[model samples]
Target chain A: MTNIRVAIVGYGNLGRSVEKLIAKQPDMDLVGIFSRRATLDTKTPVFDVADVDKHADDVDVLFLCMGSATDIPEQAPKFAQFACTVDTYDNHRDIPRHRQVMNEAATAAGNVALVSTGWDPGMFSINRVYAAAVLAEHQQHTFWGPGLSQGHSDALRRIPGVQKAVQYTLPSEDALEKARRGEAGDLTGKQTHKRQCFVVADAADHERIENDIRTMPDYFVGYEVEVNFIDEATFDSEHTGMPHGGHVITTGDTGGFNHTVEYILKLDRNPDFTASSQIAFGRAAHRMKQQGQSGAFTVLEVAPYLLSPENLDDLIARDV
Target chain B: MTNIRVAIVGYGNLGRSVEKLIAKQPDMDLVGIFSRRATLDTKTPVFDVADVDKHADDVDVLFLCMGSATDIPEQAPKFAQFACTVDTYDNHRDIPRHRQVMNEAATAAGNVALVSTGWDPGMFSINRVYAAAVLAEHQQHTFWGPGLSQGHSDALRRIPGVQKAVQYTLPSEDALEKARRGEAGDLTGKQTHKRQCFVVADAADHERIENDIRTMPDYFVGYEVEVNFIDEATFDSEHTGMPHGGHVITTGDTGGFNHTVEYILKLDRNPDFTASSQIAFGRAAHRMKQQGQSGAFTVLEVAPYLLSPENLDDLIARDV
Candidate 1:
């Protein structure tokens, strides 16, 4: 048995999903769950977030299930000082600074912090690097959607007077078809995707909400975005499950021949897929920690073998 | 400057090519070369293999540019006991045992040893694992050739009365075409390739030589092997340069949609390209040793980022 003790912080969507995964992992025990406010949960022990360090000695890895915007920046460094951490921090632009911040704290404490450990920032990031490294002369394009946008949906729900919301990213069929044929050269993300949002809101002026979303620099700007308003009951009945997925494609040549390398993800539930990645990396963080490694790492830095449970011989046998 | 101190243990084709690469690397230095018999070298200091242990303190990594059959088995463990080592050990079947042998020696000595650092066993190995890990439900097919086979050529040269030999593996055009179209499934290497060899031999009975070459278990037994005899002058004039390359493709589905991921390598000079990989891993070995890592690792276990000179941000910037 691996004997990995995992603790999850933040009892939100990602946190609950992580517990579902940890329970399925025979080697890992969900030792504790910490939240901002303690809830009367069914079975697992729950602790206040303020008291996280008190139980750090009991956990092998702490899954930081907090929001990337502010929660992870403040909490990741703090918790990493005592315990190894794995997080689904998806703030793309601030990642370099965020990595360094976690690096300083984890290195000082001789622990590891694995950042952005979700499907998009995690699996997609590794795929990009691997393809680029192997096929040196290549152009990479990442297309997300025909699925739910968890971060974007969360962003929309935060708008004033918004009761609930869900956003989906639909890839441009023309661009995708071109990419599949290895002819989509230098196509930017904006050209390949459009955002569609269904909102249930109390705002009298729908124009304000639509304008705010369409103008959001980080999520919707430069994208062809469509917004529609619906009643709360209709939203609740239609949008029940969190389904999402995407593609990462590299088109290039070697020895004067054209080739395409691609990695795809098709998730039935966004949180569960993201949680599955966290557990795999949770094992990775603990293994690295045991090896006396201390730093902040992304999917780009961790070896692929560490993410798999199979031994090398068996892994090769199954794959080849 | 990275200032990595590197030493080559064998002055064969791969070793000579490695020196060429080291000269081009501003961050690396060709500290010394070691061989069983040292001759007058132009510039870089040359040492006898017996004296390798004496200069272990001066070298950061020892490049075991020797054969996989016997040389790496004996030399890799021995050299790794004193200094970090990197080798292009192509013995696929014996790798597990070889890795453990080197692991014991290197781990006991607190030094790192990176094995199978060439394109096929190295880059191709990484690609296979990455694809399999990301695309869980996938069939992987590797097509080598329409290019030179260094190991096969060496094998043929060792045959009695063989003056010179060059071997080329040509991929099955039909299988490759299907794979390119994401249709090839469960295709074995034997089904995907055939070997072609050109030899200059002293044997009066060419049939016996042809029979030996055709029946060699490791190199030719399973495939349709074609042998041709030519004069030394013709062989020298026609096959002067070493060139090789191949493709690694993974055909699989994520969710319910089918997808294909592939990695391609095209080398103008086989030994030089293989040598280039050794230098990259030489840097990796030294960097890992500095971090107090002691183990035998393959391309599957080493982080892709460590094998590149670019920092994470720059690497992502260029790739994405």
Candidate 2:
């Protein structure tokens, strides 16, 4: 059996999750871990990100378990020049741009790259598309979290004076009810949820920070959003857990009868689930590269079977 | 670009449909067509079933487009010994037994066989399993037509002294309403639909034929079934169209909020759609055989991508 050689380009919570899962898979072998620093706090041999290309021939796929905002855009294509790559770059609207960027780099290098292999942009994206295809007449709605949103929290923490932060996404009750009732109206991301940000910051212009938070385009443009300032210790005590969950509901009609189709994910640890998605897609990237494909693709483009661990016949028998 | 060599075992409506589809696929070739008669009324070259083994070495897959009750049971295992096979064997309760028979033969020959590749047993079966897996807390309901029922019609035609027949399956309004409302109650096949049979018989005991249909286990038992006697001219004129459609709806909840997931198919031609399903799974059977798998499986076991004609990256792109 030919096993896939894998490497982690970031050694944070997501990378740690990927490391633990590599041991669980029979067909994958972990080759190395690369971090910004030459050393990490753990015993795992951490190499500097600059040295990643040195072992390119030894690795089959690289899991870019780094932040989507900055790290993935820079690292993914560079690594794609050697080994295939998988990244959870969940900036939904910017995906086409990201895909184009990765496409140029990967195509030139003759390797495969899978982008946005996370829960929302990845799995939830797949469900929404599948539901739309299955039920031609449908109003699609995606509701995320009465739980912590990692991306939003990260956005808040990036504020100039913010010390620590956590963002909670709460589904609007009226919007969810209308969706469940098979409403004829379409729901925008703004109408679906309200964002609540808990922040810790030093002495700064409070009004400026509030404006920045309210004016954010993808995160908080036209929604009911609230921000609260707290001490770092209080933030540390309450927001240490990584809880996230969401739903993709398609309300539609067929033969004059109303029907609803929904897909859900509930997770206690957000990064771990995101780690799981990228890991599975890592297998898909390796297989696609072996099949002589070179391009940047999303979870939408990847077939469910390619992400599966079982044999072809076994999967048909088990999944169905 | 290796092409899969395909052969049809029967040249009825379903087989004719399959033949037309083979011309549409770029990667499949029609090697031969086998029939009970050496001379079919068509221009297409027809061979006797006895000569099927002679071209077994040339054909990669054989579609068993024959009756589920008698033809497939005997032919599937026999043909599976030589080439990979696909059949629309819709006897749901008898699947395990059919699977066992095909498994032994295919395993011994080191080939593959896909059973129940028709719409209900094939496509609808797939939707059911997928919905169940995706929504764990669910009440599953399957509603089949206010349209022609192929298997039931075939069963009626097989009855002694029967000349021509057509069966219509009507979904019960009460059962569908309860299911759509997310009722806690479960649904049985009997609760789902009532069967209506129109038959033309030549001087037979009318009571006996009606009793036979109502007593049949898989086709008619435990449902509000009705029978009507008609002339051949009336039956032919009224029932020539093969219109059929159905729904597989799952009502369930995540995080204490109710959600309904529904999959609906409204087909104008039943045999054409059934033909579409088997043709797709035919590709799946060929791939599995090439992968060194030997087993009898259903649509549940096969991954959606194997049945798909697009490139993995292309599918991910267009589908998502």
Candidate 3:
């Protein structure tokens, strides 16, 4: 009947955003923060991920927006023992056989864990489900922006390219086109429409560098990660693209029964909508708790289960 | 290797929109159009819904974007016998014990039957699943506009206590805010952000008029129905509020992890999206057939099922 207790593990770009959202919710009480490193994002003391069990007695919802995907599944059951847990994703469901092992752990603990709650894998996954409705045409997309994740830039540089790999953001259609043509144009636009992945790779390894970077999807989540294999002379002069943020054009047919639905992450908000999505799922976990939910439920499944409970009150409100 | 052949059943506002979308698809063959009545929107000849069985001999997909939510099931199986079937929502699922009866009918026929494939029931339902994830505050929405279905307008006017009921669209936030305050505002705006329902009812029937209009959801599937109850004199002089195409504010927390995702029905496009969504589901039904899918499926379940097959060749070209 009172507020649901919430905690955030991992104090990075997303955890900080979740912290702010949880603080504003009247129905949620922020009680703890867990992070591998220290930060000023929260006044609450940050505990190491191992100490999550200490809050088991008080926390109702624990958000695991931290750590590598490889490590989360096994750790999920352990956290589920302490409280209801919400995670980003199971790394595209790769921890396959392990999920069952983890789910059994949640079931035994009599709690619920919601995974695939992040905007990238989860929201885009949600979009594709609907986009397939207009399947008359093939689906295609063009992404642009200054979306170089720092970690991915490092990964790109390490890929035997033998030189620098930098990510730059280019804004606006005109600007992106200009950058696409290697022409000088206004680079200060706020649109965040293109990224200049300035590369000084050896001409020999250029092919492998592009292929290797594309394979780094696990390391770079939000970015489309396109590369521009440029000459070494251009490297020092690379001050064009902004590296703000980028968007995805997922749908194919734009104007008919066959259609197009484009999804863009806002460049302006750093923590942004994706953070809100994970935090919101925490509330959904609370709702699941009320319904006596147990075991591990994917965000995809928890939704239909929760929204179907006797009413559309959560959807529509009158004159409020 | 050929395009899917599709037919439209039940013509009106929605069927007409579906017609245009299907007409534009290169990978789809527009076989024929079937309607309860005839219209001029198509160069193709229109047949009554009763004659659909004949077209079934040729059509690969049959879109049932027409008919009442009550009558679609039996006809669904009958139509499924001819081609894969798609409908607005499940009437038999309403019967609870009848889905097995309906699904078997579709399965035995070796095709797919997709139910509830429109915007309000399908897309909005999709929205709620993701919307629930950002649970920061109570969820509420206000949808306005020239969204009155001709059928629902008739339904509201037919209400017991209403002297007259009319739906109007006023398009803009400035206009919506002015109208919301009950002050006179510009009624001829180009943006649709508000809707007005005016009624001159017997004082005793005021409650009934509101309730009746609300109950007319069956007739009025898309717009949020609200009323301005007035005395006969006020009704006779009712010229103040504006009705415009509008959007719903799905979440209030945008600044932080607390967030809202708004849904605008593309009203400026003449309420075309709802029809597009229903028609899109027919396209998805074709995809189901490609994979040898049979039986009855909801738009909700069919999405995850269809999108999980292989890759996003449909979402993007060879590479970014």
Candidate 4:
């Protein structure tokens, strides 16, 4: 079998983890590391993208395990011509725009570029698509994702406007009463009155979209998506500040989150940022591979492919 | 100002209580008492409805505080033509039908009739209407009533279907949870589960009908109504068999419930037969006074008159 030479773009927690996984893979070779920051005592040559043309000949695949959403767009484009396949899990809002620019660069240089591949955007898309396929005959859908972090440090809390979006946005008084009673589901109407620290840019829009999915007849029918942040008091009291735990539950006739290929990602105290990033990027690359590497694509548009059980399993166990 | 002579149709607990209230009212006179069972030693003339016609000439109004729903139809028509208004707190299902028959019979014999006057059907209607009027522009409406009984007795157990309902129709899971946490005003999901005992009767459809009031573009917009029967488990501990008590909380732009009304009826302990029935009949009598000598009405039609601020204040001072 031919070897797939892969390079890690960032030597952060996740980037290093990806290199370890590559080292373990028999058909894949860890070519070198590329990052602006110095990664200590590495066997491979570390190169800067500013002079990427000098080191471009070494790698086949580039795993863009960069730090933030802001860093990916500028850095990924410089290596668009050099790499055979490029993927990233940089939590970016303008993923479609970033992908479009990278893909343009990739097409010009005869390469592949995929961006914004992670839990929320990546696996969530897959789950939604799977649900939609199963529920093709049904009219309503309910998506319930349970056990999100309630502590102030959730990645969602880090976003600029998330606190305001989540603040005071809760179920009705009657519903709240039901939740407190536990006569209803786990946490039906419970609200977190305290201000959370981070916020996701699309928090409000996401909620609104979920509501539309629930109410809109043209979509799947009836849809209710409950994204619950873990009960902070329960978590703090019981787990004592360990990482919050949660799961997603989507219900419908067929096309729903639970019905679709479901994914559960867990991060230990120090999460595998590189592998996680690679998995996300791999989803984008897989989508491009399936879609013939042409035409306009979007996070929403990729829902069907992501949700397909066969494709999802393949993505998750790609290394295996 | 001619005095209104009132006759108690059944010498049950409610009848005795009514006699006492009659004694307190300056314009009201307790003229006679009628019961199938033995009579109590009161100043009023006592007779069975079998012989009620004999004393028909003396009373201006006949208040039927009967125990069961079975005999109301047979007895109500017999007193239809007397020179008095016939009002009843009978647990009859065909109240409106019986009322129609009584009204026709009364018109033929020259009398008036009122049927199904009580807490759930009578006072509840008034409270709801008043709330609707006050919160003229609310987006939603909810009616909540709590009746807590911690005592154990055969009488409590004997109600034909009470035990079964209590056993099977568990308090909302939400309510129980809240009670555990010592909170108030909670509810479960709106979907109704089928149970035998409290199979919400058609008469109580007002809880659903009120939502239509918001349909009229001129009156209000965006309204939903949910009625819940929350149990004491939400506030009381298990195995203790203790009741923390309950309250009726109406929610919207305006919400009101007469604790005094419940108190006046002595509904805290024996809500079904004693207190709720008395309150319903008492309000009907008050309505008969306002509407004048010859007319027919149901609890739903007459309850609004009893919910006046003045009457509420009077009830508070007298009952609570």
**Candidate with maximal lDDT:** 1
lDDT of all the models against the reference? Answer: 0.78, 0.76, 0.57, 0.42
TM-score, second chain, candidate 2: 0.94
CAPRI accuracy category, model 3: incorrect
lDDT of 1 at B115: 83
- Residues B161-204, candidate 4, lDDT per residue (tens digit)? 22211212113445433422324233322321111112112344
Residue A187, candidate 4: alpha-carbon lDDT:
38
Ranking by TM-score: 1, 2, 3, 4
| Ranking of predictions according to DockQ | 1, 3, 2, 4
The list of candidate 2 runs beyond 4 A from truth reads: A184-186, B1-320
Top-down lDDT ranking = 1, 2, 3, 4
DockQ, computed on Cα atoms, for candidate 3: 0.11
List iRMS for all predictions: 4.9, 7.1, 7.1, 28.7
List the candidate 3 regions with Cα displacement exceeding 4 Å: A34-42, A45-55, A69-74, A89-104, A134-258, A289-295, A304-311, A314-320, B1-117, B120-170, B173-276, B279-320
- Candidate 1 has which clashing residue pairs, if any? none
Best of the candidates, TM-score: 1
True contacts kept of 2: 0.09
**DockQ scores of all models, one per candidate:** 0.18, 0.10, 0.11, 0.01
The alpha-carbon deviation from the true structure for residue B239 of candidate 4, after best TM-score superposition, in angstroms, is 38
Candidate 3 lDDT: 0.57
Model 4 RMSD to the real structure?
27.1
TM-score of each: 0.73, 0.61, 0.54, 0.33
Per-chain TM-score of candidate 1, chain B: 0.95
Per-residue lDDT for B40 in model 4?
A: 62
